[PDB]
Design an enzyme around this catalytic site. Structure first.
Site, PDB file in Angstrom:
ATOM      1  N   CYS B   1       0.825  -1.202   0.000  1.00 23.94           N
ATOM      2  CA  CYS B   1       0.000   0.000   0.000  1.00 23.94           C
ATOM      3  C   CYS B   1       0.862   1.257   0.000  1.00 23.94           C
ATOM      4  CB  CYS B   1      -0.939   0.006   1.208  1.00 23.94           C
ATOM      5  SG  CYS B   1      -2.113  -1.368   1.250  1.00 23.94           S
ATOM      6  N   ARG B  48      -3.368   0.030  -3.444  1.00 19.54           N
ATOM      7  CA  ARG B  48      -3.822  -0.972  -2.491  1.00 19.54           C
ATOM      8  C   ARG B  48      -3.163  -2.318  -2.762  1.00 19.54           C
ATOM      9  NH1 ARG B  48      -9.877  -3.119  -2.722  1.00 19.54           N
ATOM     10  NH2 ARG B  48      -8.758  -4.398  -4.257  1.00 19.54           N
ATOM     11  N   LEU B  49      -2.874  -3.046  -1.688  1.00 20.67           N
ATOM     12  CA  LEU B  49      -2.302  -4.384  -1.756  1.00 20.67           C
ATOM     13  C   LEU B  49      -3.343  -5.384  -1.272  1.00 20.67           C
ATOM     14  CD1 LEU B  49       0.237  -6.027  -2.428  1.00 20.67           C
ATOM     15  CD2 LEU B  49       0.925  -5.786  -0.035  1.00 20.67           C
ATOM     16  N   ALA B  50      -3.629  -6.385  -2.097  1.00 18.28           N
ATOM     17  CA  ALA B  50      -4.615  -7.401  -1.751  1.00 18.28           C
ATOM     18  C   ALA B  50      -4.074  -8.344  -0.682  1.00 18.28           C
ATOM     19  CB  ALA B  50      -5.028  -8.180  -2.988  1.00 18.28           C
ATOM     20  N   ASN B  70      -0.693   4.364   4.913  1.00 26.90           N
ATOM     21  CA  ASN B  70      -0.200   3.100   4.368  1.00 26.90           C
ATOM     22  C   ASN B  70       0.504   2.352   5.493  1.00 26.90           C
ATOM     23  N   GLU B  72      -0.406  -0.418   9.272  1.00 26.40           N
ATOM     24  CA  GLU B  72      -1.325  -1.192  10.099  1.00 26.40           C
ATOM     25  C   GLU B  72      -0.986  -0.932  11.558  1.00 26.40           C
ATOM     26  OE1 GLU B  72      -1.310  -5.389   9.414  1.00 26.40           O
ATOM     27  OE2 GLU B  72      -1.105  -5.898  11.540  1.00 26.40           O
ATOM     28  N   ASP B  91      -8.365  -0.134   9.599  1.00 24.99           N
ATOM     29  CA  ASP B  91      -7.948   0.145  10.966  1.00 24.99           C
ATOM     30  C   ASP B  91      -7.384   1.551  11.133  1.00 24.99           C
ATOM     31  OD1 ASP B  91      -6.188  -1.094   9.170  1.00 24.99           O
ATOM     32  OD2 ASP B  91      -4.715  -1.478  10.752  1.00 24.99           O
ATOM     33  N   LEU B 242      11.790 -14.663   7.433  1.00 29.62           N
ATOM     34  CA  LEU B 242      13.102 -14.640   6.793  1.00 29.62           C
ATOM     35  C   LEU B 242      14.119 -15.214   7.771  1.00 29.62           C
ATOM     36  CD1 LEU B 242      11.846 -13.224   4.468  1.00 29.62           C
ATOM     37  CD2 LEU B 242      13.472 -11.340   4.719  1.00 29.62           C
ATOM     38  N   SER B 349      10.839 -10.263  10.261  1.00 29.46           N
ATOM     39  CA  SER B 349      12.294 -10.242  10.248  1.00 29.46           C
ATOM     40  C   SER B 349      12.794  -9.507  11.481  1.00 29.46           C
ATOM     41  CB  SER B 349      12.836  -9.582   8.975  1.00 29.46           C
ATOM     42  OG  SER B 349      12.450  -8.221   8.902  1.00 29.46           O
TER      43      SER B 349
END
Lengths: 516, 515
Positions: B1, B48-50, B70, B72, B91, B242, B349
């Site tokens: 995002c 937007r990122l699915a 962008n 969370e 959110d 990772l 990570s």
């Protein structure tokens, strides 16, 4: 408002946003550029005029329905109540999604009495649908490529800029009024045309007295339908004005509009607008009508220099080179600019379409038979999306204004065209005799207006074009404009300006006027 | 995002749209490009990122508030405490629900998570810009004395922008931990009013053992690390990890897998390790994966792809630092492999452990524990340029997400509040407190918990040795006057950065301090 779609795109969507913004003049209040999930090649674009409704309309109940529509559907409350359809948004066009889900595309376009142009996308069924009003109001222009590149815009200015690689030629054509096109969405963003069907007009049942075809039983029906058209065009949250050209149609529209506005408990006074030269008879008639009805009349004095300077702008906005529409649209463009500047009325009601439906043109006096006159009227109505609706719509929308044409409603026009041809034809030497007779006792407009060096405006245009256009070019014009070769200098200059703005796209017009 | 907002634009908006699409790699699913009613010069854009939202957030309860963020936050489900009804499923709307409650200072100081937002209040005629304390989510601002403002996620979305009224516009990274207030003039243009730091934890009072003895601190650190992993677990996308083979990555992977098992998660954990053929780091990562049982994916990247990816790595990272590029090549390659052959978007990570826990080799040569603490704090303040910058630019470049579990507000605040003696290496082994913390939980094998510590630099130098001529390094003092590269590798990085970003080379002041 301005709609815009780019189903299929081999290029990025950023280089194709300038074409989308080329129609920003329709609504200068908002603008949204949005893509589609899974089909990122295809996108959308909307411009709004005059809080927190916007487009595309994506509702929770129909996640796969994407609708980008502009116009007004008048019978949305009469159908949301007939069939309970919970509307998430306040947008008038949300009912289109519900109707499409209920009964497909054929039945969602024949129950939209009103003016509209919409683009519908169904990811679940993988289909794209286009639509336009049956008379050409709220236009639509489509660009199609053999690979599957599809573009839709409110005006043609948003498509000629578009760049499509791997195809040297892109064909931009006006969408045929009264048609719906079903295209299949291939799983790469491109579309393939599947069908194109004309739905014509309709006589909706959920809209009193329609006994038959007698003279006293026709005038009453005409009055009822005209009043109902004005009432259903009244519904809006924006101020409504009127254009008083001095003719019978404009005067009747203004009188009925004032009566219904007073019946609707409207506080703002009606603003009637007239454009013309000094002490012109048309301006005198407009002032007489305004005084008879008592409206806030705004007279605009036409000066030739402004029209000469705005010739290029009106040719750019109207996207046509026909002489008659440009001459009739220069003044309309100026009056719309005046309305936008000095007044706060955006919705504009005009009597467009009356002359092509009520046999209001002079040459109809030379009709060999009433059937020929009826056929000519129907042909004019079919080709109205190029001559007068274009002039009354593009010029109006170039200043962020909306157009309402009560004479072009479905029910009243259908009833008038269903009348016997012996009644529509002029009777006692005056055209549109039935329309004049239908309002004899209503006292809507003065009687002298109900029944009614020379026009020194076109002389300035003629002399200016004659001075600006050489005779050698006119002789050369046979091999310079092979399609729709101008016959006069005025047509040559209009074509030159039109090609300067739109190069190589002159197929949008094929005839001019006057089938005597 | 990705977020990209313009205020006071005078050179139209369609020609300025191609600059926004430069951050489309952050989210390639959807894209919106809106305006501001009454402020047509101002515009918004979100990538937007699915299934049905975009982030020019306008809530009917706050019609004059337009928010684009962008990130969370992990403290939204504050909704129960404040009984704040949410119209949308995002959110970030709670930010608006907080902005009306107590303004911007109280709103930004109670957001537990990564975030960088821009908010427009038309009623109060103000614009607010915000970024997290460690700058995990990037934010770049370009402001002109006239009143122009351009707030984007990455810098690639701002260098393309054009000012028709000013020849030069200054694109600078938004500071990690500041909130900026601007007055919204009627012409859409914004002046500058105020910029105050909010620092760190103030949300732990209104959301979810004293002493410094060695057992209590270990228990508290374990509890806080588990809580950080648990609060970062919440997402609708798949979660990966990772496995660098070190202590931090192994600990994060073990705790993540344990919480996922406690979360009744059906999909197995996917741990990725990139490295050379038969390297100790890859063997350690394989050992950790076998011990925890996570599905392990190993990449044996060869020098040719790393060399060919140098240009893209420098373009995405937006920096010419040697170590950042060296790590970013591998991070970019592993992120590309993760996107290509795996459906895991969220990545965990340990970016921030070697700085907060003082786990660098040079920390042994510390003049005093107070000096080591000051150095660690200095590294944390500049973490938005070296390690977090790479871990975000090489992750969002492939449509992925990064969730650093070590840079938690409460965990970092508690670790930095400890006595400096405990944080310093104890018996010649760095990160002694961290290793002792998990010595009884059996999260990872003892051979990897202890034993503190692949020839990729040599081929890198060989490639950039016959590329910067000895004459080109002599005039480096007159070709790159600001931050002159002292080595040929630095010169190559700088020339690639200048080719991608010309002139705007003031983003990196120093290079990296090993002492």
């Amino acid at each position: 408002c301005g709609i815009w779609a780019l189903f299929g795109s081999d290029d990025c969507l950023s280089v194709q946003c300038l074409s989308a913004m080329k129609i920003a003049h329709r609504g200068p209040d908002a603008f949204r550029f949005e893509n589609v999930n899974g089909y990122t090649n295809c996108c959308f674009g909307f411009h709004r005029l005059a809080p927190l409704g916007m487009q595309p309309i994506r509702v929770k109940k129909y996640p796969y329905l994407w609708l980008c529509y502009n116009g007004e559907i008048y019978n949305h409350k009469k159908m949301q109540q007939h069939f309970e359809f919970e509307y998430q948004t306040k947008v008038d066009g949300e009912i289109i999604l519900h109707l499409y889900d209920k009964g497909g595309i054929e039945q969602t376009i024949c129950m939209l009495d009103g003016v509209f142009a919409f683009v519908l996308l169904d990811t679940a069924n993988k289909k794209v649908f286009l639509g336009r009003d049956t008379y050409g109001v709220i236009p639509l222009f489509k660009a199609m490529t053999e690979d599957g590149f599809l573009a839709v815009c409110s005006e043609a200015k948003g498509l000629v800029t578009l760049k499509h690689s791997a195809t040297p030629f892109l064909k931009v054509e006006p969408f045929l009024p009264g048609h719906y096109e079903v295209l299949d969405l291939k799983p790469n963003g491109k579309v393939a045309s599947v069908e194109m069907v004309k739905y014509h007009h309709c006589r909706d049942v959920p809209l009193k007295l329609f006994p038959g075809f007698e003279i006293e039983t026709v005038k009453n029906n005409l009055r009822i339908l005209f009043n109902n058209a004005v009432k259903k065009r009244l519904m809006t949250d924006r101020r409504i004005g009127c254009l008083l050209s001095g003719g019978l149609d404009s005067s009747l529209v203004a009188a009925t509009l004032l009566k219904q506005l007073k019946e609707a408990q409207v506080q703002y006074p009606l603003q009637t607008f007239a454009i013309g030269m000094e002490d012109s008879p048309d301006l005198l008639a407009a002032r007489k009508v305004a005084d008879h009805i008592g409206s806030e009349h705004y007279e605009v004095l036409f000066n030739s220099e402004e029209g000469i300077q705005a010739l290029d702008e009106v040719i750019f906005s109207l996207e046509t080179y026909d002489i008659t529409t440009v001459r009739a649209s220069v003044g309309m463009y100026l009056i719309s600019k005046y309305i936008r500047k000095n007044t706060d009325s955006v919705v504009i009601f005009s009597g467009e379409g009356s002359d092509e439906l009520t046999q209001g043109y002079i040459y109809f006096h030379k009709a060999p038979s009433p059937e020929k006159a009826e056929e000519e009227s129907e042909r004019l109505l079919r080709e109205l999306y190029l001559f007068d609706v274009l002039r009354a719509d593009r010029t109006t929308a170039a200043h962020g204004l909306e157009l309402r044409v009560p004479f072009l409603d479905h029910r009243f026009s259908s009833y008038y065209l269903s009348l016997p041809p012996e009644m529509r034809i002029p009777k006692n030497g005056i055209e549109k005799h039935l329309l004049r007779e239908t309002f004899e006792d209503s006292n809507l407009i003065p009687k002298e207006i109900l029944w009614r060096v020379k026009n020194s405006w076109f002389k300035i245009l003629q002399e200016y074009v004659e001075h600006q256009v050489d005779d050698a070019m006119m002789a050369n014009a046979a091999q310079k404009f092979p399609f729709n070769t101008p016959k006069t200098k005025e047509g040559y200059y209009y074509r030159q300006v039109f090609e300067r703005h739109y190069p190589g796209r002159a197929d949008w017009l094929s005839h001019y006027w006057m089938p005597k």
